[PDB]
From TrEMBL, chain A:
CDD domains, per database record: KOW_RPL26
Gene giving rise to this polypeptide: rplX
Domain KOW residues, every copy: 2-29
Family from the record: Belongs to the universal ribosomal protein uL24 family.
Name listed for the protein in its UniProt record: Large ribosomal subunit protein uL24
SUPFAM superfamilies the UniProt entry points to: Translation proteins SH3-like domain
Species name: Enterococcus faecalis
Automatic annotation (TrEMBL), chain B:
Summary of subunit composition and partner proteins: Part of the 50S ribosomal subunit.
Family membership: Belongs to the universal ribosomal protein uL15 family.
GO molecular function: rRNA binding; structural constituent of ribosome
Gene that produces this protein: rplO
Large ribosomal subunit protein uL15/eL18 domain residues: 27-95
BP terms from Gene Ontology: translation
Gene source species: Enterococcus faecalis
This protein's name: Large ribosomal subunit protein uL15
Domain of life: Bacteria
Range of residues in the leader sequence: none
Function of the molecule: Binds to the 23S rRNA.
Keywords: Metal-binding, Ribonucleoprotein, Ribosomal protein, RNA-binding, rRNA-binding
GO cellular component terms, semicolon-separated: cytosolic large ribosomal subunit
Length: 101, 97
RNA sequence: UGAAAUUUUAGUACCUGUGAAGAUGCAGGUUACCCGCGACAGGACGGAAAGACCCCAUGGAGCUUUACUGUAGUUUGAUAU
RNA sequence: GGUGUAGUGGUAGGAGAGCGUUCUAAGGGCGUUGAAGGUCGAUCGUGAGGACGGCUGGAGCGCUUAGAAGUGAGAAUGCCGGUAUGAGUAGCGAAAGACAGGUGAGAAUCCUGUCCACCGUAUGACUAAGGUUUCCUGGGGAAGGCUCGUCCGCCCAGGGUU
RNA sequence: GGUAGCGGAGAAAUUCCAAACGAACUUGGAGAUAGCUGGUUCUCUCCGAAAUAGCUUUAGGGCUAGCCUCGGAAUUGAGAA
RNA sequence: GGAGCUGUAAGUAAGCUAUGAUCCAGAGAUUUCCGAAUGGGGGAACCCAAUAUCUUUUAUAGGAUAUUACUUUUCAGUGAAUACAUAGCUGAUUAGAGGUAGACGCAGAGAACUGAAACAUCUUAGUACCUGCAGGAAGAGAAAGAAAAUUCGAUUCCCUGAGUAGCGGCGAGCGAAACGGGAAGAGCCCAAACCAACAAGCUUGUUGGGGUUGUAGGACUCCGAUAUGGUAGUCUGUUAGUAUAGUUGAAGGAUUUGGAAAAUUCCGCUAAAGAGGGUGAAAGCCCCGUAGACGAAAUGCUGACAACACCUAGGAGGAUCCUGAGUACGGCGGAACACGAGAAAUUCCGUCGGAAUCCGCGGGGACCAUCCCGCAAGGCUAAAUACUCCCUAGUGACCGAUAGUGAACCAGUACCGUGAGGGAAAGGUGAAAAGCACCCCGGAAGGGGAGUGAAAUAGAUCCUGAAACCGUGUGCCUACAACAAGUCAAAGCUCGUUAAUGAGUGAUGGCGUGCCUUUUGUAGAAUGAACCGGCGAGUUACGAUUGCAUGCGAGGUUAAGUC
């Protein structure tokens, strides 16, 4: 997948449009991704998860990975991805510039 | 079916037979041949190439109903006598294949 | 606590007559405040069941026989082994 | 297109004109500023039927021409599903229970106890088959139990056959 | 344990053979056949019958004619009163 | 291949992973027990053994592994009546079993309902069913032919011939073939005469050589080539491709609405890519992908190319020999041929009888003669043809949850039945569980607030949410009235529209016996319907005929098949 854990990322669609953030986890079998600060839903929680009030948590729901646009780590302008065989090894590469990742 | 009443086919008699050696000839009635240029040679090959006769069943027979107006070296399997008269009178020539 | 058969819709009287010939429903006349409860069972040609009596079908099935046509077996002969 | 004359009851049935549904091809256009469908309207057309609005709804659908059909339902003792009717009616499936206490949100119905009644060549004790977990313990009362139920051969978690 | 349907068993009744046995049940041929009953869905307009003859192992079925409808055609306009 | 992975299936735990995981593909290993089940048995998924080695135990008992079914083929050893021997027995070997694909095709056996308006011949139908053999296809197949042309040259299949010729209680119905056109194309072996070798007992069994045919052929007698082409073969190899994993694969950002933009507007970009799908709504430019370009270590498959292997000869004579025997044929009885004994050729089965062989034999629809064509009684043979349990890629003027498979959901399930067997129902929250923390009533369920959410009258009976049916309230009317329950007129009362000779209700009066079916005729005491909703009946293929329309016109038109 063109998205991978440890990647600063821009969002394309949603109420959290134009926000940035990194990848906390990725679900390829759903083609979804989780992003800190984005889609922070308010979950009425029970205390069976070591939360001795039950309470109301705020946690990041997944996001569909097609609503996402990666960032150049050297430009800030968000881009699309190509795959290139550099040094024999296959890596992601920016469009709009040849920067890796 | 007439409701059990004796049907029309059953109350009537069978008649005749079929001759397996029957010769059924393809007919050309002498008004066609005003087509072809005088003096030429008419044949089953010519008639087929023109499209007049498509089925040379047993052979071409020529018959005289219409008026002939040409000299023609016609040839076929059989001619009728009136056709012979008309052709030979116009000035043609009968042959037989 | 909780069914069923039945059920075209129904604010479902009586006499006489009419009428697919025996009417809760049509007519004419009469009687009858509205809604129920318990009982009965005259009617709704009540329900149940495409009448088992009858007739029809060029229907079916079983059965009988000196009906027809055949046949398994039984018997006689010829021939082969 | 108009004027006149004459006609326009209708079954079986024949003929001709259509409305509507689904889909397709093309054209064109309408939809989160809310499509279809649903529902109410006192609307238009000779009829089949067609619009426009109000509320619902939440994503696909109309209009023109032509075409292809699983093309139109009120009956088939029709099929499937739903809900009525009878009707809160019959029935609640042979027999004796009463009381005090207790448990409990709640008790004719469960538990403990005392009297009482029933069986007793059995309504008792073994046991083959068959059933195949219904046995025991601890909880439960959603459903089942022809009532109820704190209870059960029901449900749930564990165990049990040497 | 044995007898199985063109059959078995029958102290024999047409009796029993897994809750209807004059020939079980099931599957297939099979959407059997049905001159028989029931049903057959939107509209308008034009016209509009018959229930008769003859024949029929035919009589509540069918065929032809008769009666209806539609299209064409021609003919000294025959048709009706 | 390159980072999340431990299925459905949440959730908890424990853990794995660039030391390259999960995942994907090829090959190999393990593969319990039943089942052909096969050591013996048995009520399948259980039991009990024999022999050899090894193991446990002080030793038994116990345990593991291997082998042990029957039948066929060959070989060997023993060996009865019975002497020789054979049978039999034992041991080694060899190849069969059984189910699939509810489909296709050869053979055996073989119905009836039905139609003939009854019915027996006949038809349905050599169908269904059963059984056997199978193969990817099978079967048929290289003329004892088709014809009448002196001519075509192996089978099969499509068109056509043709619904013709014929068959037929001359009824109902049945129904060809050849010619012609095409698809595909291929022809080969053997016995026999004779020759060489072996053997017993000059013939006669085995091996090899030879030789396969009809303008007759071969053996045999003479003349030279040692050739020349082909192959319907081989895990002989190589080579190339292809199937089974895959990789890459261009182009957009902002305004309005809105919860969300893919919609709207703005200017752009791209296209060997505007196929399709998904993405918070309808996206050419977000994603998967598409066009296009690359790629296989390993196992298969296909086709070529070399090696091996197998076939492959020519000209005269016919002195003599051979050229498929209980065979062809005939009689009787039956079948199949379109052909129902009929004038009945042809083919086949049973039975009985019973030929010649090159001056020979069979056919040309009884049969004889002439002519022509062919040479049986021995075998094989690809291709075009039929079918799909299945695999891959897909397509639809096919279905869209009473439809489409019986089954979109753990369906051949639950359930019914002793059993064979029959046989259901049941889909949709939301973009995302964010699925209602917390509070109150209550035993709980279930409600009410709060809160998430765009929306909760989207909260598990979850999108929409009709009707029947059950209710609540409210405007008008109703307790001297009989009424297929409406219609027409109409007072009074109450509301105010798709604003137009308005809506609702309705005292009271006049007229008026439901709908369907079937009937001479039904309000019907003749039939059907409890009601609502869904489903549910003149269609298609091939032909014929009539009309309408078009094209062409005494010429109008192709079928099959190829691209
Ligand atoms: K009564
Ligand atoms: K009888
Ligand atoms: K309908
Ligand atoms: K009869
Ligand atoms: K073959
Ligand atoms: K798209
Ligand atoms: K014959
Ligand atoms: K009235
Ligand atoms: K026509
Ligand atoms: K024409
Ligand atoms: Mg008669
Ligand atoms: Mg009477
Ligand atoms: Mg009377
Ligand atoms: Mg009246
Ligand atoms: Mg009472
Ligand atoms: Mg009755
Ligand atoms: Mg009756
Ligand atoms: Mg009229
Ligand atoms: Mg009138
Ligand atoms: Mg639609
Ligand atoms: Mg229909
Ligand atoms: Mg109905
Ligand atoms: Mg009562
Ligand atoms: Mg009791
Ligand atoms: Mg006693
Ligand atoms: Mg107990
Ligand atoms: Mg109860
Ligand atoms: Mg208990
Ligand atoms: Mg008797
Ligand atoms: Mg049949
Ligand atoms: Mg065994
Ligand atoms: Mg019959
Ligand atoms: Mg044919
Ligand atoms: Mg791309
Ligand atoms: Mg969408
Ligand atoms: Mg755009
Ligand atoms: Mg012969
Ligand atoms: Mg014979
Ligand atoms: Mg279904
Ligand atoms: Mg639905
Ligand atoms: Mg009075
Ligand atoms: Mg009053
Ligand atoms: Mg009345
Ligand atoms: Mg009635
Ligand atoms: Mg009724």
């Amino acid at each position: 997948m063109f998205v991978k854990k440890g990647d600063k990322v821009k969002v394309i669609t949603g109420k959290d449009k134009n926000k940035e953030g990194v990848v906390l986890a990725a679900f390829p079998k759903q083609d979804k991704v989780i992003v800190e600060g984005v889609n922070v839903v308010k979950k009425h929680q029970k205390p069976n998860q070591a939360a001795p009030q039950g309470g109301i948590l705020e946690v990041e729901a997944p996001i569909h990975v097609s609503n996402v646009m990666v960032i150049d780590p050297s430009n800030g302008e968000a881009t699309k991805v190509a795959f290139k065989e550099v040094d024999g090894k296959k890596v992601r590469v920016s469009k709009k510039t040849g920067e890796v990742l | 079916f007439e409701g059990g009443q004796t049907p029309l086919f059953r109350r009537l008699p069978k008649r005749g037979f079929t001759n397996i050696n029957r010769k059924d000839y393809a007919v050309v009635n002498l008004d066609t041949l005003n087509r072809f240029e005088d003096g030429t040679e008419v044949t089953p090959v010519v008639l087929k190439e023109a499209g007049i006769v498509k089925n040379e069943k047993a052979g071409i027979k020529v018959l005289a109903d219409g008026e002939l107006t040409k000299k023609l070296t016609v040839k076929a399997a059989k001619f009728s006598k009136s056709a012979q008269e008309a052709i030979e009178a116009a000035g043609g020539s009968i042959e037989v294949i």
